[PDB]
């Protein structure tokens, strides 16, 4: 249960991006600028 709860709670980490929310990154930036932040979030969540 603790491992599952930790995996859920790690979704609120920025991992060096401007936000932990994907929708904010998509809606605030164009494709080229948002690709970097989405790649950072993807790398962090894949590591988790």
């Amino acid at each position: 249960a603790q491992a599952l709860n930790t995996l859920v709670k790690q979704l609120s980490s920025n991992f060096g991006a401007i936000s932990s929310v994907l929708n904010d990154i998509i809606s605030r930036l164009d494709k080229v600028e948002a690709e970097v932040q989405i790649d950072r979030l993807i790398t962090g969540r894949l590591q988790s």
């Binding site: 401007i18 809606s27 605030r28 930036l29 164009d30 600028e33």
Partner: protein
């Protein structure tokens, strides 16, 4: 900002934290406007 196209010709339109192409789909909770006059070569200094 498309209203200003027929009157004002912007020599500098640089946005930080948001994309300028995404400005027509965003709603802001607070907006401030700072106005001044500098020299032509000092416009580059208005940046982080």
């Amino acid at each position: 900002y498309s209203v200003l196209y027929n009157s004002t010709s912007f020599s500098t339109f640089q946005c930080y934290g948001v994309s300028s192409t995404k400005l027509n789909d965003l709603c802001f909770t607070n907006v401030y406007a700072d106005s001044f006059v500098v020299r032509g070569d000092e416009v580059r200094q208005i940046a982080p």
